[PDB]
Design a protein around this ligand. Sequence first.
Ligand SMILES: NC(=O)c1ccc[n+]([C@@H]2O[C@@H](COP(=O)([O-])OP(=O)(O)OC[C@H]3O[C@@H](n4cnc5c(N)ncnc54)[C@H](O)[C@H]3O)[C@H](O)[C@H]2O)c1
Lengths: 75, 83
Amino acid sequence: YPELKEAITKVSKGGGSEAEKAIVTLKNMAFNQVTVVGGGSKAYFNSFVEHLPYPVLFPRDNIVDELVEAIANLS
Amino acid sequence: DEYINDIINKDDFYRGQHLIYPGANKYSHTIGFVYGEMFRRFGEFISKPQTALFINGFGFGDYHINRIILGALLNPSFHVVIY
Ligand SMILES: NC(=O)c1ccc[n+]([C@@H]2O[C@@H](COP(=O)([O-])OP(=O)(O)OC[C@H]3O[C@@H](n4cnc5c(N)ncnc54)[C@H](O)[C@H]3O)[C@H](O)[C@H]2O)c1
């Protein structure tokens, strides 16, 4: 949830919707099974793309475009 | 003995459907059948796994072969040595 600190400020100062209170109360747990991530883009879908690691044994070189262009030109 | 010599040195002597070469009578299915079948066996032969194909000292004067090879690159077991 990107709006993490905002919810904390709202509850401390008063107000906030039911979702903010729920996330605040369920986030206070100090357990390793719950992870807290905050940021302007870390919680967004964009940051999730780069988090995926490449396999150790899977080849990393890209040779698909070469095959496609070879097929297009020669064939 | 019988027919080749006459064709060679008999001047004006020709007939209809008697000879099959080179790729001559394709408008007739009967002849074409032979070349189509040989090419079919060749094409489904390269589809085999763990098969080695050789193209050595070839000028690549044909068109179908090159396009078929380009479209058949899905096989990761293609090796070529050309002079
Ligand atoms: N079942 C089949 O495989 C099949 C299919 C279709 C047609 N055909 C036959 O194909 C038709 C014509 O085919 P084609 O005669 O034009 O093919 P082709 O015999 O001319 O192809 C090979 C040629 O390339 C020449 N060449 C030029 N440079 C070369 C180089 N650097 N290295 C090697 N060779 C070089 C060679 O002189 C010669 O071998 C015939 O009408 C028909 O009989 C056969």
